[PDB]
Short mmCIF file of C-alpha atoms and ligand atoms in Angstrom, two decimals:
data_model
loop_
_atom_site.label_atom_id
_atom_site.label_comp_id
_atom_site.label_asym_id
_atom_site.label_seq_id
_atom_site.Cartn_x
_atom_site.Cartn_y
_atom_site.Cartn_z
CA UNK D 89 67.26 137.67 174.90
CA UNK D 90 66.87 135.50 171.83
CA UNK D 91 71.09 135.73 171.51
CA UNK D 92 73.66 133.34 171.92
CA UNK D 93 77.57 134.15 171.29
CA UNK D 94 80.14 131.86 169.76
CA UNK D 95 83.46 132.11 169.79
CA UNK D 96 85.95 130.25 167.52
CA UNK D 97 89.25 129.62 166.29
CA UNK D 98 89.19 130.39 162.48
CA UNK D 99 90.47 127.28 161.18
CA UNK D 100 87.91 124.60 163.00
CA UNK D 101 85.69 126.47 159.93
CA UNK D 102 87.55 123.86 157.95
CA UNK D 103 85.75 120.98 160.30
CA UNK D 104 82.58 119.64 161.67
CA UNK D 105 81.50 123.80 163.12
CA UNK D 106 79.49 124.74 160.31
CA UNK D 107 77.73 121.91 160.12
CA UNK D 108 76.95 122.20 164.23
CA UNK D 109 75.96 126.03 163.19
CA UNK D 110 74.08 125.07 160.29
CA UNK D 111 71.77 122.21 162.18
CA UNK D 112 71.52 124.53 165.36
CA UNK D 113 70.16 127.51 163.08
CA UNK D 114 67.32 125.37 161.85
CA UNK D 115 66.27 123.93 165.62
CA UNK D 116 66.01 127.74 166.72
CA UNK D 117 64.91 129.98 164.05
CA UNK D 118 64.14 132.35 166.73
CA UNK D 119 67.85 132.33 168.13
CA UNK D 120 70.23 135.17 166.90
CA UNK D 121 73.36 133.58 166.82
CA UNK D 122 76.90 135.57 167.14
CA UNK D 123 79.47 134.13 165.52
CA UNK D 124 82.89 135.57 166.38
CA UNK D 125 86.52 134.25 165.39
CA UNK D 126 88.93 134.33 168.24
CA UNK D 127 91.96 131.91 169.53
CA UNK D 128 91.51 130.05 172.45
CA UNK D 129 93.80 132.20 174.78
CA UNK D 130 90.96 134.87 173.94
CA UNK D 131 88.20 132.64 174.86
CA UNK D 132 89.22 132.71 178.17
CA UNK D 133 88.62 136.95 178.95
CA UNK D 134 85.59 136.66 176.40
CA UNK D 135 83.53 134.25 178.39
CA UNK D 136 84.33 135.78 181.78
CA UNK D 137 83.13 139.18 180.24
CA UNK D 138 79.90 137.60 178.89
CA UNK D 139 81.09 138.61 175.12
CA UNK D 140 80.92 134.74 174.48
CA UNK D 141 78.87 132.32 175.80
CA UNK D 142 80.92 129.22 174.41
CA UNK D 143 84.21 128.93 172.32
CA UNK D 144 85.74 126.25 170.24
CA UNK D 145 89.26 126.11 170.67
CA UNK D 146 91.94 123.36 170.55
CA UNK D 147 93.54 123.36 173.53
CA UNK D 148 92.59 123.65 177.43
CA UNK D 149 93.88 126.39 179.01
CA UNK D 150 92.95 126.36 183.15
CA UNK D 151 91.32 129.34 184.51
CA UNK D 152 88.66 129.19 187.36
CA UNK D 153 86.17 131.49 185.96
CA UNK D 154 85.87 128.92 182.80
CA UNK D 155 85.14 124.89 182.86
CA UNK D 156 86.17 122.80 179.34
CA UNK D 157 84.89 119.92 177.84
CA UNK D 158 86.45 117.57 175.37
CA UNK D 159 84.70 117.22 172.49
CA UNK D 160 87.34 114.95 170.04
CA UNK D 161 90.73 114.35 169.30
CA UNK D 162 92.00 114.90 165.79
CA UNK D 163 94.88 113.13 164.23
CA UNK D 164 97.75 114.93 163.07
CA UNK D 165 99.05 114.79 159.71
CA UNK D 166 102.22 115.96 158.10
CA UNK D 167 101.41 118.37 155.13
CA UNK D 168 104.84 117.95 152.57
CA UNK D 169 105.44 118.71 148.74
CA UNK D 170 104.83 115.69 146.68
CA UNK D 171 108.46 115.50 145.45
CA UNK D 172 108.98 115.32 149.49
CA UNK D 173 110.56 111.85 150.17
CA UNK D 174 107.78 111.71 153.00
CA UNK D 175 105.42 111.85 150.67
CA UNK D 176 106.44 107.97 149.65
CA UNK D 177 104.55 107.29 152.91
CA UNK D 178 101.16 108.78 152.10
CA UNK D 179 99.57 105.31 152.65
CA UNK D 180 101.36 104.02 155.13
CA UNK D 181 102.31 107.08 157.90
CA UNK D 182 105.41 108.46 159.48
CA UNK D 183 106.23 108.97 162.56
CA UNK D 184 107.39 112.31 164.74
CA UNK D 185 111.22 110.69 164.35
CA UNK D 186 111.43 110.95 160.81
CA UNK D 187 110.28 114.99 160.82
CA UNK D 188 112.93 116.40 163.40
CA UNK D 189 115.85 117.91 161.03
CA UNK D 190 112.78 119.01 158.21
CA UNK D 191 112.14 122.47 158.33
CA UNK D 192 108.70 122.80 159.90
CA UNK D 193 106.12 125.31 159.87
CA UNK D 194 104.54 126.11 163.05
CA UNK D 195 101.14 128.50 163.89
CA UNK D 196 99.39 130.57 164.61
CA UNK D 197 101.38 133.82 165.64
CA UNK D 198 98.83 134.46 168.45
CA UNK D 199 99.93 134.83 171.82
CA UNK D 200 100.64 131.28 173.83
CA UNK D 201 99.76 129.34 174.94
CA UNK D 202 98.18 128.29 171.18
CA UNK D 203 97.78 125.18 168.90
CA UNK D 204 101.53 125.14 168.37
CA UNK D 205 102.63 124.49 172.11
CA UNK D 206 100.99 121.20 171.74
CA UNK D 207 102.93 119.76 168.76
CA UNK D 208 106.31 121.45 170.34
CA UNK D 209 105.37 119.32 173.09
CA UNK D 210 104.82 115.93 171.92
CA UNK D 211 107.97 116.31 170.05
CA UNK D 212 109.25 116.87 173.53
CA UNK D 213 107.77 114.30 175.31
CA UNK D 214 110.09 111.51 172.95
CA UNK D 215 113.42 113.44 173.64
CA UNK D 216 112.84 114.58 170.16
CA UNK D 217 114.22 117.88 169.43
CA UNK D 218 113.22 119.78 166.05
CA UNK D 219 116.13 121.90 164.36
CA UNK D 220 114.51 124.19 162.35
CA UNK D 221 110.99 125.47 163.25
CA UNK D 222 109.31 128.58 161.73
CA UNK D 223 106.45 130.39 162.93
CA UNK D 224 103.74 131.55 160.49
CA UNK D 225 100.06 133.47 160.79
CA UNK D 226 97.78 130.25 160.54
CA UNK D 227 97.07 127.49 158.93
CA UNK D 228 96.36 128.34 155.53
CA UNK D 229 99.08 130.31 155.05
CA UNK D 230 101.64 127.16 156.22
CA UNK D 231 99.80 125.07 153.73
CA UNK D 232 100.20 126.97 150.61
CA UNK D 233 103.44 127.59 151.61
CA UNK D 234 104.48 123.90 151.83
CA UNK D 235 102.92 123.74 148.51
CA UNK D 236 105.03 126.79 147.50
CA UNK D 237 108.73 124.36 148.97
CA UNK D 238 108.70 126.32 152.44
CA UNK D 239 108.78 122.49 154.54
CA UNK D 240 106.43 120.77 155.97
CA UNK D 241 103.79 121.36 158.63
CA UNK D 242 102.11 118.92 160.94
CA UNK D 243 98.26 120.17 160.66
CA UNK D 244 95.07 118.77 162.05
CA UNK D 245 93.14 116.02 159.79
CA UNK D 246 90.43 118.26 159.69
CA UNK D 247 92.26 120.76 157.03
CA UNK D 248 92.30 118.13 154.20
CA UNK D 249 89.18 120.75 153.33
CA UNK D 250 91.95 122.28 151.94
CA UNK D 251 93.64 120.53 148.46
CA UNK D 252 96.06 122.47 146.58
CA UNK D 253 98.39 121.43 143.68
CA UNK D 254 101.15 119.01 144.60
CA UNK D 255 100.22 119.48 148.26
CA UNK D 256 99.72 115.53 149.85
CA UNK D 257 98.60 115.17 153.29
CA UNK D 258 100.66 112.29 155.48
CA UNK D 259 99.58 109.93 158.03
CA UNK D 260 101.23 110.76 161.43
CA UNK D 261 101.49 106.83 163.24
CA UNK D 262 102.64 108.54 166.89
CA UNK D 263 99.20 107.52 169.26
CA UNK D 264 99.75 111.25 170.81
CA UNK D 265 100.19 112.65 167.49
CA UNK D 266 96.56 114.30 167.62
CA UNK D 267 95.37 117.80 168.67
CA UNK D 268 92.22 118.69 170.70
CA UNK D 269 88.93 120.39 170.20
CA UNK D 270 87.51 122.17 173.51
CA UNK D 271 84.05 123.99 173.85
CA UNK D 272 84.87 126.19 177.11
CA UNK D 273 82.00 128.07 179.00
CA UNK D 274 81.54 130.10 182.12
CA UNK D 275 81.92 127.92 185.52
CA UNK D 276 78.74 128.16 185.87
CA UNK D 277 75.26 126.15 185.37
CA UNK D 278 74.79 126.18 181.18
CA UNK D 279 72.03 127.79 179.57
CA UNK D 280 69.14 126.35 177.76
CA UNK D 281 70.64 127.56 174.90
CA UNK D 282 74.36 125.97 175.72
CA UNK D 283 72.86 122.83 176.57
CA UNK D 284 71.20 122.62 173.37
CA UNK D 285 74.08 123.39 171.58
CA UNK D 286 75.63 120.32 173.42
CA UNK D 287 72.94 118.06 171.80
CA UNK D 288 73.20 119.36 168.43
CA UNK D 289 77.35 118.48 168.80
CA UNK D 290 76.32 115.22 170.05
CA UNK D 291 73.85 114.51 166.79
CA UNK D 292 76.30 116.27 164.57
CA UNK D 293 79.20 113.42 165.85
CA UNK D 294 76.74 110.58 165.58
CA UNK D 295 76.24 111.16 161.80
CA UNK D 296 80.13 111.04 161.54
CA UNK D 297 79.98 108.06 163.19
CA UNK D 298 82.28 108.67 166.35
CA UNK D 299 82.01 106.35 169.40
CA UNK D 300 80.59 109.35 172.40
CA UNK D 301 82.70 108.39 175.65
CA UNK D 302 81.78 107.97 179.12
CA UNK D 303 79.34 111.08 180.70
CA UNK D 304 80.26 113.07 177.51
CA UNK D 305 78.69 116.51 177.48
CA UNK V 89 123.26 137.71 148.42
CA UNK V 90 121.71 136.63 146.61
CA UNK V 91 118.18 137.08 147.76
CA UNK V 92 114.51 137.74 145.92
CA UNK V 93 111.70 138.43 147.93
CA UNK V 94 108.16 138.31 147.06
CA UNK V 95 105.08 139.81 148.02
CA UNK V 96 101.57 137.74 147.99
CA UNK V 97 98.02 137.93 148.70
CA UNK V 98 97.87 134.87 150.85
CA UNK V 99 94.14 133.85 149.00
CA UNK V 100 96.53 133.42 146.11
CA UNK V 101 98.28 130.60 147.75
CA UNK V 102 95.28 128.72 146.24
CA UNK V 103 95.65 129.23 143.02
CA UNK V 104 98.97 128.44 140.30
CA UNK V 105 101.61 131.00 142.67
CA UNK V 106 102.82 127.45 144.44
CA UNK V 107 103.67 125.09 141.82
CA UNK V 108 105.40 128.70 139.96
CA UNK V 109 107.30 129.91 143.31
CA UNK V 110 107.95 125.98 143.46
CA UNK V 111 109.31 125.65 140.34
CA UNK V 112 111.04 128.68 139.99
CA UNK V 113 112.97 127.61 142.99
CA UNK V 114 114.16 124.16 141.29
CA UNK V 115 115.27 126.08 139.16
CA UNK V 116 117.96 128.29 141.13
CA UNK V 117 119.74 126.40 143.50
CA UNK V 118 121.91 129.56 145.01
CA UNK V 119 119.21 131.97 145.74
CA UNK V 120 116.99 132.71 148.74
CA UNK V 121 113.50 133.11 148.47
CA UNK V 122 111.71 135.47 151.08
CA UNK V 123 108.05 134.79 150.85
CA UNK V 124 105.41 137.58 152.45
CA UNK V 125 102.42 137.59 152.89
CA UNK V 126 100.75 141.15 152.33
CA UNK V 127 97.72 143.32 150.56
CA UNK V 128 98.27 144.50 147.47
CA UNK V 129 98.54 148.03 148.64
CA UNK V 130 101.21 147.26 151.51
CA UNK V 131 103.02 145.58 148.23
CA UNK V 132 103.07 149.01 146.19
CA UNK V 133 104.53 150.77 149.24
CA UNK V 134 106.63 147.86 150.02
CA UNK V 135 108.07 148.08 146.24
CA UNK V 136 108.62 151.42 146.37
CA UNK V 137 110.63 150.88 149.29
CA UNK V 138 112.66 148.02 148.19
CA UNK V 139 111.17 145.68 150.71
CA UNK V 140 110.40 143.16 148.05
CA UNK V 141 111.20 142.42 144.46
CA UNK V 142 107.91 141.46 142.95
CA UNK V 143 104.26 141.76 144.44
CA UNK V 144 101.65 139.23 143.25
CA UNK V 145 98.12 140.92 143.72
CA UNK V 146 94.14 141.65 142.81
CA UNK V 147 94.41 144.58 141.91
CA UNK V 148 96.39 147.66 139.93
CA UNK V 149 97.43 150.84 142.48
CA UNK V 150 98.55 153.51 139.67
CA UNK V 151 102.31 154.56 140.66
CA UNK V 152 104.91 155.58 138.79
CA UNK V 153 107.70 154.10 140.54
CA UNK V 154 105.78 150.68 139.76
CA UNK V 155 104.84 148.57 136.73
CA UNK V 156 102.00 146.33 136.89
CA UNK V 157 101.06 143.13 133.97
CA UNK V 158 97.84 141.23 134.42
CA UNK V 159 98.76 137.83 134.34
CA UNK V 160 95.03 136.38 133.53
CA UNK V 161 91.84 137.47 134.83
CA UNK V 162 90.19 134.57 137.25
CA UNK V 163 86.24 134.19 136.96
CA UNK V 164 84.32 135.02 140.36
CA UNK V 165 81.70 132.48 141.64
CA UNK V 166 79.42 132.54 144.04
CA UNK V 167 79.78 130.60 147.20
CA UNK V 168 76.27 129.49 148.84
CA UNK V 169 75.12 126.23 150.93
CA UNK V 170 74.35 123.30 148.62
CA UNK V 171 70.09 124.05 149.98
CA UNK V 172 70.56 127.47 148.60
CA UNK V 173 68.03 128.65 145.29
CA UNK V 174 70.86 129.88 143.79
CA UNK V 175 72.74 126.51 143.50
CA UNK V 176 69.78 125.39 141.25
CA UNK V 177 70.98 127.02 138.45
CA UNK V 178 74.83 126.34 139.18
CA UNK V 179 75.25 124.56 135.42
CA UNK V 180 73.72 127.13 133.60
CA UNK V 181 75.15 129.95 135.79
CA UNK V 182 73.35 133.48 137.78
CA UNK V 183 73.50 136.80 137.00
CA UNK V 184 75.12 139.65 139.38
CA UNK V 185 71.35 141.09 139.48
CA UNK V 186 70.20 137.39 140.53
CA UNK V 187 72.78 138.11 143.84
CA UNK V 188 71.41 141.62 145.54
CA UNK V 189 68.94 140.70 147.75
CA UNK V 190 70.95 137.82 149.73
CA UNK V 191 73.19 138.45 153.07
CA UNK V 192 76.49 139.18 150.99
CA UNK V 193 80.00 138.27 152.62
CA UNK V 194 82.91 140.57 151.22
CA UNK V 195 86.39 140.17 152.61
CA UNK V 196 88.77 140.79 153.27
CA UNK V 197 88.67 143.67 156.58
CA UNK V 198 92.35 144.83 155.23
CA UNK V 199 93.00 148.35 154.36
CA UNK V 200 91.32 149.73 151.21
CA UNK V 201 91.07 149.24 148.46
CA UNK V 202 91.34 145.27 148.73
CA UNK V 203 89.48 142.49 146.67
CA UNK V 204 86.07 143.73 148.13
CA UNK V 205 86.59 147.26 146.46
CA UNK V 206 86.55 145.56 142.92
CA UNK V 207 83.58 143.43 144.23
CA UNK V 208 81.06 146.27 145.28
CA UNK V 209 81.79 148.15 142.02
CA UNK V 210 80.99 145.43 139.89
CA UNK V 211 77.67 145.67 141.19
CA UNK V 212 77.76 149.72 141.57
CA UNK V 213 79.00 149.55 137.83
CA UNK V 214 75.31 148.14 136.43
CA UNK V 215 73.34 150.39 138.74
CA UNK V 216 73.24 147.09 141.36
CA UNK V 217 73.12 147.87 145.27
CA UNK V 218 73.54 144.58 147.71
CA UNK V 219 70.47 145.30 150.26
CA UNK V 220 72.69 143.05 153.31
CA UNK V 221 76.56 143.07 153.73
CA UNK V 222 78.45 142.21 156.01
CA UNK V 223 82.55 142.07 155.80
CA UNK V 224 84.57 139.16 156.83
CA UNK V 225 88.14 139.17 157.82
CA UNK V 226 89.32 136.76 154.65
CA UNK V 227 88.01 134.47 152.79
CA UNK V 228 88.41 130.99 154.81
CA UNK V 229 85.71 133.18 157.23
CA UNK V 230 83.43 133.64 154.06
CA UNK V 231 83.33 130.05 153.18
CA UNK V 232 82.63 128.69 156.80
CA UNK V 233 79.83 131.24 157.45
CA UNK V 234 78.44 130.52 154.03
CA UNK V 235 78.80 126.15 154.86
CA UNK V 236 77.08 127.55 158.43
CA UNK V 237 74.26 129.24 156.99
CA UNK V 238 74.70 132.82 157.17
CA UNK V 239 74.47 133.98 153.54
CA UNK V 240 76.26 133.93 150.37
CA UNK V 241 80.19 135.18 149.16
CA UNK V 242 81.71 136.04 145.66
CA UNK V 243 84.97 134.58 145.66
CA UNK V 244 88.04 133.95 142.71
CA UNK V 245 87.24 130.12 141.05
CA UNK V 246 90.91 129.04 142.49
CA UNK V 247 88.76 129.21 146.12
CA UNK V 248 87.21 125.75 144.59
CA UNK V 249 90.78 124.28 146.30
CA UNK V 250 88.29 125.17 149.67
CA UNK V 251 85.71 122.08 149.82
CA UNK V 252 83.54 122.06 152.74
CA UNK V 253 80.97 120.40 153.34
CA UNK V 254 77.25 121.38 151.91
CA UNK V 255 79.38 124.59 150.43
CA UNK V 256 78.85 124.64 146.45
CA UNK V 257 80.90 127.38 144.13
CA UNK V 258 78.14 128.77 141.25
CA UNK V 259 79.60 130.27 138.29
CA UNK V 260 78.21 134.14 137.48
CA UNK V 261 77.62 134.95 134.04
CA UNK V 262 78.33 138.50 133.81
CA UNK V 263 81.33 139.24 131.51
CA UNK V 264 83.32 141.34 133.82
CA UNK V 265 82.63 138.88 137.07
CA UNK V 266 85.95 138.31 137.13
CA UNK V 267 89.35 139.62 139.42
CA UNK V 268 92.64 140.40 138.18
CA UNK V 269 95.91 138.50 138.91
CA UNK V 270 98.74 141.15 138.71
CA UNK V 271 102.13 140.96 138.91
CA UNK V 272 104.45 144.13 140.16
CA UNK V 273 107.64 145.21 140.01
CA UNK V 274 109.72 148.49 140.74
CA UNK V 275 109.68 150.69 137.71
CA UNK V 276 113.12 150.08 136.27
CA UNK V 277 113.29 146.37 137.41
CA UNK V 278 115.88 144.83 135.12
CA UNK V 279 116.89 141.62 137.31
CA UNK V 280 117.59 138.56 135.81
CA UNK V 281 116.14 136.76 138.74
CA UNK V 282 112.88 138.88 137.84
CA UNK V 283 113.39 137.78 133.76
CA UNK V 284 113.21 134.18 134.97
CA UNK V 285 110.36 135.07 137.31
CA UNK V 286 108.51 135.87 134.19
CA UNK V 287 109.16 132.97 132.14
CA UNK V 288 108.50 130.73 135.06
CA UNK V 289 105.19 131.98 135.16
CA UNK V 290 104.64 131.79 131.20
CA UNK V 291 105.45 127.95 131.32
CA UNK V 292 103.10 127.37 133.96
CA UNK V 293 100.12 129.12 131.71
CA UNK V 294 101.41 127.66 128.99
CA UNK V 295 101.21 124.33 130.29
CA UNK V 296 97.43 125.00 131.98
CA UNK V 297 96.36 125.90 128.18
CA UNK V 298 96.07 129.98 129.43
CA UNK V 299 96.96 132.79 127.23
CA UNK V 300 100.78 133.97 127.64
CA UNK V 301 101.07 137.07 130.14
CA UNK V 302 102.45 140.23 128.54
CA UNK V 303 105.80 140.83 127.32
CA UNK V 304 108.87 141.68 129.18
CL1 LIG Z 401 95.57 127.88 162.48
CL1 LIG Z 402 95.87 130.90 139.66
CL1 LIG Z 403 72.06 125.35 134.82
#
């Protein structure tokens, strides 16, 4: 069987994932690559059942039947309307403690734990308690709503692929204001095709100029 | 009390709708604005059932309880990988009949009729039958898949708010390669807040150099 099945959180298409898949396809003309959008939690049973072979997700959910490699962390940004006071710090950055009384749009609306779990945790980690929280379906909706004046949202740096009139991305300076990208696979030896996918990720990351950590992939 | 409820197709947040909503909000400090993401089909029933007061959609479903106003037509474009042959005539543009042997990604997967209905209809309208079609959930899936090398996609021009590495947007030349933007309200709707909403649309459109939408 020359088929590999890859699960991915949809919003990862705003980042390096499409470049990775494009290079992978080029490297493997005889391979059928099937792409399936699914939340990070859903990738656990998909891997266990053999419905996907590798899953690109935004957190690590422990299950004995699967294993994980952290690919990288993205910086979080604060998406704001251009008229917001916070946008005056567009070039400099702000901190989590500048955000606690703002209307924050969280996402996605899929089962917990999800992307938003870590976002709320980094507030809790420093004794900060956001007083105005709303959950919306997914990140590009949150961004559109921010542009419409509905509030602010903490978003991965990769979401800057989306640029909207009077939408601005403000850096978050807290060193832990970051969000992980993981690759998850079955808890067994990776296939030749999955090992090749690892090498493709390495190559794209090298083109981006990322420094590899020790014993990476 | 006092509240206005606005239904909208999610992808319309990539165009002028947010700045319309924001300008409108500024003019009404006492107004609660509730925004609801929903497909154009759902807006019709939501309007008849009183769950929204105005719907911004991408097609017209005729119903005697609803009245529509065509705000404008967006040009359709072809999203392609940078290396695609179609991307060699981005300046001059291509026609629908140039797309027929390509793998076309349709969207969204919401109930029909939807954006993809008109897309397939404009091909059918000229005796063109795309030989390879696949439906995906919504526009960003299509764009990512195009960027990943899986095919091409027809998208509204406002989609260009999303820029991906090696993703290019090619104009279409067919005069009917367009997609409408409608506002829909209940037939006997005469609220001052709805009047104000239409005037806000008018002001935003005027500033962009567009034609004034139809009369109240
Ligand atoms: Cl998301
Ligand atoms: Cl628009
Ligand atoms: Cl040309």
